[PDB]
Amino acid sequence: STGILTNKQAVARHFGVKQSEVVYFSVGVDLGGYKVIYDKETQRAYSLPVGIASGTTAVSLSTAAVLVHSAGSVDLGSLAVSREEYVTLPGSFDSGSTLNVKNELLTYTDGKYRWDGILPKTVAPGSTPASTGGVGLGAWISVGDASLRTQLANGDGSLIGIHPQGTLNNVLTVRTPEQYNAVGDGIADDTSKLKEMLSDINNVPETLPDAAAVNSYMEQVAVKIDLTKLYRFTETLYIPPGVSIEIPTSNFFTRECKQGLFYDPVDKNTAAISLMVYRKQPDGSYKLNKDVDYYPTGLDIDNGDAITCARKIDINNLNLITAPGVKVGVKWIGGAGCTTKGLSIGENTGSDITTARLPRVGLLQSASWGSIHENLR
Amino acid sequence: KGSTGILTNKQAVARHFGVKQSEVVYFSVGVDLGGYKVIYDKETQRAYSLPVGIASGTTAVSLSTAAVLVHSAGSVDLGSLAVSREEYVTLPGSFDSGSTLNVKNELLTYTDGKYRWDGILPKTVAPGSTPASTGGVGLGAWISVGDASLRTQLANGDGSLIGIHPQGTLNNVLTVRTPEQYNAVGDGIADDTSKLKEMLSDINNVPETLPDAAAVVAVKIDLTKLYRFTETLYIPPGVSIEIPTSNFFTRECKQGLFYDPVDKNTAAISLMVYRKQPDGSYKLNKDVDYYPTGLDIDNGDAITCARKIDINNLNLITAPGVKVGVKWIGGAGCTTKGLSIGENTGSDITTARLPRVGLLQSASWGSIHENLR
Ligand SMILES: [Zn+2]
Numbered sequence: 001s002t003g004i005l006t007n008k009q010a011v012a013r014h015f016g017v018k019q020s021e022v023v024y025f026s027v028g029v030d031l032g033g034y035k036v037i038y039d040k041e042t043q044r045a046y047s048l049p050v051g052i053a054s055g056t057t058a059v060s061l062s063t064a065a066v067l068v069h070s071a072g073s074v075d076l077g078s079l080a081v082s083r084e085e086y087v088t089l090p091g092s093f094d095s096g097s098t099l100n101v102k103n104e105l106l107t108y109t110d111g112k113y114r115w116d117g118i119l120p121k122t123v124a125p126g127s128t129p130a131s132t133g134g135v136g137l138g139a140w141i142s143v144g145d146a147s148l149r150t151q152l153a154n155g156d157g158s159l160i161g162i163h164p165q166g167t168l169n170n171v172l173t174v175r176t177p178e179q180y181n182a183v184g185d186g187i188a189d190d191t192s193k194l195k196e197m198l199s200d201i202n203n204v205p206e207t208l209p210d211a212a213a214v215n216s217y218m219e220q221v222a223v224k225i226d227l228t229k230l231y232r233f234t235e236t237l238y239i240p241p242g243v244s245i246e247i248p249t250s251n252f253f254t255r256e257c258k259q260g261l262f263y264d265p266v267d268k269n270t271a272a273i274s275l276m277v278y279r280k281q282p283d284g285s286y287k288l289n290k291d292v293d294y295y296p297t298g299l300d301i302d303n304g305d306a307i308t309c310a311r312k313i314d315i316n317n318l319n320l321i322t323a324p325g326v327k328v329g330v331k332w333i334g335g336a337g338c339t340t341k342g343l344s345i346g347e348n349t350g351s352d353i354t355t356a357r358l359p360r361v362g363l364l365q366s367a368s369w370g371s372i373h374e375n376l377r
Numbered sequence: 378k379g380s381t382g383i384l385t386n387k388q389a390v391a392r393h394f395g396v397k398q399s400e401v402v403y404f405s406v407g408v409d410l411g412g413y414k415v416i417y418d419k420e421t422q423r424a425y426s427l428p429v430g431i432a433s434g435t436t437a438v439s440l441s442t443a444a445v446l447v448h449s450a451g452s453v454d455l456g457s458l459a460v461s462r463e464e465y466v467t468l469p470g471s472f473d474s475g476s477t478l479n480v481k482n483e484l485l486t487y488t489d490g491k492y493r494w495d496g497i498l499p500k501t502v503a504p505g506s507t508p509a510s511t512g513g514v515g516l517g518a519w520i521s522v523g524d525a526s527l528r529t530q531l532a533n534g535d536g537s538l539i540g541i542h543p544q545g546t547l548n549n550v551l552t553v554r555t556p557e558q559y560n561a562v563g564d565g566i567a568d569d570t571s572k573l574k575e576m577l578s579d580i581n582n583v584p585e586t587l588p589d590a591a592a593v594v595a596v597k598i599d600l601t602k603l604y605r606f607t608e609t610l611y612i613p614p615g616v617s618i619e620i621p622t623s624n625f626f627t628r629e630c631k632q633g634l635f636y637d638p639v640d641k642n643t644a645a646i647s648l649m650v651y652r653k654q655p656d657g658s659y660k661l662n663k664d665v666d667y668y669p670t671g672l673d674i675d676n677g678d679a680i681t682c683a684r685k686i687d688i689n690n691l692n693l694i695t696a697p698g699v700k701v702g703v704k705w706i707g708g709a710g711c712t713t714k715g716l717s718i719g720e721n722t723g724s725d726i727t728t729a730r731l732p733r734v735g736l737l738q739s740a741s742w743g744s745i746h747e748n749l750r
Binding site: 005006009010012013014015016017018019021035047048049050051082083084085143144145148159160161162163164165166167168169170171173215218219220221222223224242243244311312313314336337338339370372 | 523559748
């Protein structure tokens with residue numbers, strides 16, 4: 001009775017309306033002029049649509065907050081969603097719950113969701129949005145600031161619109177070692193970072209069944225890599241097919257290289273960078289060449305003794321420096337039709353050559369018909 | 378009774394703001410404001426957090442319908458303070474229904490989120506309004522508020538909400554266009570023709586017909602998937618097309634363009650040349666066999682609309698039997714690097730995905746093709 005009045009007061013203050021603007025549902029009640037309706041059964045309140053005339057009377061109110069009156073029908077649940085007027089249910093996806101209204105939210109570990117499908121919706125204990133219908137229209141829809149933060153943080157850019165149309169993920173096509181948390185100071189060992197970056201472009205196994213297998217990997221999507229800092233690495237890097245490597249500008253024999261790759265192995269009887277050539281094993285399989293002195297010959301290709309796995313490789317301005325004493329800078333083996341521009345090998349460390357950061361042999365190349373090196377340094 | 382109603386109301390206000398019941402005061406002329414955290418207006422039935430620093434002894438003088446409170450020590454716009462604390466009221470109704478806003482912390486709901494009015498109050502909103510049609514969005518106008526608004530703003534923006542280093546915003550540095558922006562499938566199966574065309578058109582929308590010769594900004598396109606298309610693509614002036622690397626006798630193309638027309642007596646790709654009509658107007662050439670002569674370019678029978686075009690590493694695949702791969706006609710000073718035409722499909726050239734004629738070029742003085750394959 002007066003619990004009614006104090007409740008209308010509580011409801012009114014929650015919605016920012018007047019006490020007189022809250023009406024309790026009951027069959028026959030005049031809905032005219034009220035701003036909020038209260039269901040005394042479910043103990044939920046809902047903003048009412050504007051434009052209910054005097055003398056329009058309530059007929060029914062479902063547990064999904066569908067209101068029927070003498071003049072028509074309205075889904076108060078959807079209206080509430082449009083107004084961001086939500087109820088966050090007790091519990092979580094992990095506890096399980098049952099949802100009855102469009103404006104009910106269920107908490108997950110990464111934020112809240114509303115259910116956009118058939119109501120009522122039962123959620124079992126130990127559930128996730130993925131295991132209970134997935135996300136998207138007609139299913140779970142992410143709601144609220146906490147959810148937005150985590151979606152942005154873990155997303156791919158699809159939430160960010162760009163011009164003239166589309167979204168950010170549509171135009172991000174370049175990889176950097178910084179995506180892999182490379183330190184890039186020429187001091188830390190960034191080897192594993194660089195290898196994962198390359199492997200994420202094209203991950204070819206070091207051992208393969210037959211010839212069809214090794215050739216299957218030149219048929220992969222090509223990706224551009226941007227190197228903007230200085231990466232120390234300690235093991236030979238094998239460039240897989242379909243890689244384009246890029247640096248802003250070429251080094252012209254500068255003293256302290258601050259952008260590029262610094263090869264610093266324990267074993268100096270090696271190459272910094274090599275293309276991929278697979279060599280036939282006794283059993284008929286093929287293993288990726290790791291031998292520093294090996295290079296394929298036209299004969300080797302024809303015999304089947306070697307299969308090249310170096311197609312669609314492009315270098316633009318790569319600076320490669322090397323610890324003093326390293327045998328070979330770049331092994332351009334099997335690189336038919338592959339191209340290079342502004343490839344710089346060796347550092348002008350200073351006057352003493354025995355202490356300079358440059359290889360004994362700069363570049364070793366075979367089986368590379370139709371390859372082009374521009375502005376090689 | 379009344380005093381009871383006042384205590385229970387203070388209780389409801391206090392629960393809403395998370396303060397103590399004793400910390401809520403009703404506005405009345407002369408009330409001491411010291412120590413209270415929230416003020417309630419009986420008339421409008423609105424509550425507002427009070428600024429800290431109101432001294433005991435400071436008394437209320439007036440409180441307007443815009444929530445401007447005047448007291449004995451000064452004045453404060455409670456609506457403005459509420460905005461800073463993200464304490465709003467979402468008005469009944471919507472832009473559709475129309476409304477009147479009186480306070481700075483009132484939000485009006487629109488289909489894509491909520492907005493507050495940052496201009497002169499009160500603000501009347503006619504039924505059937507939109508923020509854009511009633512003052513636009515920005516300082517002194519409609520300001521978007523809340524998570525629903527932020528989501529739609531981000532989703533439909535250009536990146537101007539996202540700061541980048543060393544300064545500026547994301548939109549300042551986005552200089553690459555892509556078929557994925559137009560929702561191209563890029564599987565080499567779906568027909569991506571209209572998508573590619575819209576992409577090119579958005580860069581330079583040269584009509585197929587031009588009134589006179591006088592009638593007849595450059596942008597970089599990145600192609601990273603495999604797009605099947607079914608009608609000749611006409612490359613407009615001012616286009617730079619790029620792919621990460623070029624193919625070289627590649628067996629299965631998984632990156633580039635695949636021309637798969639019903640009518641095979643056509644070109645996959647063509648530059649634009651306009652030919653003079655008997656009435657003096659010009660029409661884009663669409664004849665596969667046509668090429669402009671130097672003389673044509675001189676006597677105006679043909680007008681070149683192919684300057685500033687660059688191609689890096691484009692791979693072009695063609696259904697077997699297609700007449701021409703690329704028509705480089707009128708491409709004076711235009712450049713190409715690693716253009717690859719034709720697929721090494723298999724031993725039977727009859728079924729290979731390559732054209733009868735790879736490249737046809739005329740009127741392209743000063744043109745350079747590097748590592749053409
Ligand atoms: Zn409340």
